[PDB]
Design a protein around this ligand. Structure first.
Ligand SMILES: C=CCn1c(N[C@@H]2C[C@H](c3ccc(OCc4ccccc4)cc3)CN(C)C2)nc2cc[nH]c2c1=O
Length: 212
């Protein structure tokens, strides 16, 4: 093949690497294989990979208003001063309470708000968009969140409040530092990490009680 719909050899594309981060590259081949197609990408760092349609993204931000809770996307994370692209799911479309940003649940647990300009859309997502999440606890969470929506039990926390927050199987004295839309910044008080957590997460002691 040389076309699959709007996918046409030589164009620019994002591809997913074995490290789970995505990188710009050029689509250099399209080959029917099996019931589907596979998509050969030559990355800018000279490398190459043969990716299924759900592991390439288009080099252009989605028209908001085509995006929705469930939408499969790729988004920027800001590792200190590094910047990585990581695949995720849209948990909130923009509105007043979240200061008109998108809440992205990443494939790997984490959550953060972003903007139309920090989002790339995945080319051929599964129908049930979460079925390609490799981590199971996240595949099930996202399934239940998207299906239930607009039901979203969260706890309300105020800046200053003290709570227990789970971390590697143990519950840590911690403190709430800041709240932003559907996320809170917890400070674990023994070892001094901060962490953003979705306020409906069960790592939060209140939410863990509410939910048993
Ligand atoms: C404050 C944020 C830290 N953080 C994070 N970060 C992760 C970082 C993840 C990542 C990013 C870049 C990577 O590639 C580097 C590289 C790897 C191998 C070879 C070569 C290069 C690899 C992994 C991406 N997801 C989005 C967030 N996840 C969670 C979850 C609960 N809590 C937190 C938290 O606190």
């Amino acid at each position: 093949l040389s076309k699959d719909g709007d996918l046409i050899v030589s164009m620019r594309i994002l591809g997913k690497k074995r490290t789970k981060t995505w990188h710009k590259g050029t689509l250099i081949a399209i080959q029917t294989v099996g019931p589907g197609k596979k998509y050969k990408v030559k990355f800018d760092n000279k490398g190459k990979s043969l990716l299924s349609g759900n592991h390439i993204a288009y080099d252009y931000h989605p028209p908001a208003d085509k995006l929705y809770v469930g939408s499969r996307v790729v988004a920027k994370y800001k590792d200190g001063n590094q910047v990585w692209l990581y695949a995720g799911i849209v948990a909130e479309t923009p509105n007043v309470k979240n200061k008109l940003r998108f809440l992205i649940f990443f494939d790997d647990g984490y959550a953060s708000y972003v903007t139309q300009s920090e989002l790339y859309p995945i080319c051929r997502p599964l129908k049930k968009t979460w079925e390609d999440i490799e981590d199971i606890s996240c595949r099930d969470f996202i399934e239940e969140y998207v299906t239930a929506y607009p039901n979203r039990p969260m706890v309300l926390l105020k800046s200053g409040q003290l709570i227990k927050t789970e971390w590697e199987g143990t519950w840590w004295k911690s403190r709430v530092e800041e709240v932003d839309g559907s996320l809170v910044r917890i400070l674990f008080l023994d070892d001094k990490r901060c962490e953003w957590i979705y306020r409906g997460s069960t790592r939060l002691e209140p939410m863990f009680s509410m939910k048993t």
